[PDB]
């Protein structure tokens, strides 16, 4: 029922890059999802205490949220685009794993995921 430590956004010994694909993931993908009307439940780690979801972190063992992704992108945490794309997919998948079909939160994740898929479809080639 307690909250775990959040996912790390800083790791000095992890090698990093700033690639055109990662720039796209921040400037286009993250920005688009972040401003969406349904972004709010996904802009920070799930607070299982405040939301009274005591089993959340029993079921979700790889938590991820856009607040974490935003920090990772802004602080150059990633080596490649695949790592970041995986984080987005983890976030959506967690929502579908934990909740029921037809739940508001699932409809919200689906709307964000649709836009995500449209933006990743036009991920630029590596310069
Ligand atoms: C990422 C995420 C956020 C989130 C938030 C959430 C919402 N807003 C903001 C934040 N930060 C989290 C709230 N509830 C969740 N799950 C619950 C439990 C399973 N079914 C759907 C939700 O049910 C709430 C239910 C309460 C009684 S009712 O009002 O009659 C009908 C709705 C969530 N699951 C998730 O995976």
Curated annotation (Swiss-Prot):
Residues of the site described as Acetylated histone binding: 99
Glycyl lysine isopeptide (Lys-Gly) (interchain with G-Cter in SUMO2) crosslink residues: 58
Subcellular location as annotated: Nucleus; Chromosome
Location of the Bromo domain: 17-123
Residues passing through the membrane, by range: none
Modifications made to the protein after synthesis: Phosphorylation by CK2 disrupt the intramolecular binding between the bromo domain 2 and the NPS region and promotes binding between the NPS and the BID regions, leading to activate the protein and promote binding to acetylated histones. In absence of phosphorylation, BRD4 does not localize to p53/TP53 target gene promoters, phosphorylation promoting recruitment to p53/TP53 target promoters.
Entry comment describing in which tissues the protein is expressed: Ubiquitously expressed.
Domain notes: The NET domain mediates interaction with a number of chromatin proteins involved in transcription regulation (NSD3, JMJD6, CHD4, GLTSCR1 and ATAD5). The C-terminal (CTD) region mediates interaction and recruitment of CDK9 and CCNT1 subunits of the P-TEFb complex. It is also required for maintenance of higher-order chromatin structure.
Note: JQ1, a thieno-triazolo-1,4-diazepine derivative, and I-BET, a benzodiazepine derivative, have been tested on tumors with success. Treatment with GSK1210151A (I-BET151, a I-BET derivative) has strong effets on mixed lineage leukemia and promotes myeloid differentiation and leukemia stem-cell depletion.
Disease: Cornelia de Lange syndrome 6: A form of Cornelia de Lange syndrome, a clinically heterogeneous developmental disorder associated with malformations affecting multiple systems. It is characterized by facial dysmorphisms, abnormal hands and feet, growth delay, cognitive retardation, hirsutism, gastroesophageal dysfunction and cardiac, ophthalmologic and genitourinary anomalies. CDLS6 inheritance is autosomal dominant. A chromosomal aberration involving BRD4 is found in a rare, aggressive, and lethal carcinoma arising in midline organs of young people. Translocation t(15;19)(q14;p13) with NUTM1 which produces a BRD4-NUTM1 fusion protein.
Oligomeric and partner information: Interacts with p53/TP53; the interaction is direct. Interacts (via CTD region) with CDK9 and CCNT1, acting as an associated component of P-TEFb complex. Interacts with RELA (when acetylated at 'Lys-310'). Interacts (via NET domain) with NSD3, CHD4, BICRA and ATAD5. The interaction with BICRA bridges BRD4 to the GBAF complex. Interacts (via NET domain) with JMJD6 (via JmjC and N-terminal domains); the interaction is stronger in presence of ssRNA and recruits JMJD6 on distal enhancers. Interacts with NSD3. Interacts with NIPBL.
Family per record: Belongs to the BET family.
Function: Chromatin reader protein that recognizes and binds acetylated histones and plays a key role in transmission of epigenetic memory across cell divisions and transcription regulation. Remains associated with acetylated chromatin throughout the entire cell cycle and provides epigenetic memory for postmitotic G1 gene transcription by preserving acetylated chromatin status and maintaining high-order chromatin structure. During interphase, plays a key role in regulating the transcription of signal-inducible genes by associating with the P-TEFb complex and recruiting it to promoters.
Protein name: Bromodomain-containing protein 4
Source taxonomy: Eukaryota, Metazoa, Chordata, Craniata, Vertebrata
Recorded name of the encoding gene: BRD4
């Amino acid at each position: 029922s307690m909250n775990p430590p959040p996912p790390e956004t800083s790791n000095p010994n992890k090698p990093k890059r700033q690639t055109n694909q990662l720039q796209y993931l921040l400037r286009v993908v993250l920005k688009t999802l972040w401003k969406h009307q349904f972004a709010w439940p996904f802009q920070q780690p799930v607070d299982a205490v405040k939301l009274n979801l005591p089993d959340y972190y029993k079921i979700i063992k790889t938590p991820m949220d856009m607040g974490t992704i935003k920090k990772r992108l802004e602080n150059n945490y990633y080596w490649n685009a695949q790592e970041c794309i995986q984080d987005f997919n983890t976030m959506f998948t967690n929502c579908y794993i934990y909740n029921k079909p037809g739940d508001d939160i699932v409809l919200m994740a689906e709307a964000l995921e649709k836009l995500f898929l449209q933006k990743i479809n036009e991920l630029p080639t590596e310069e």
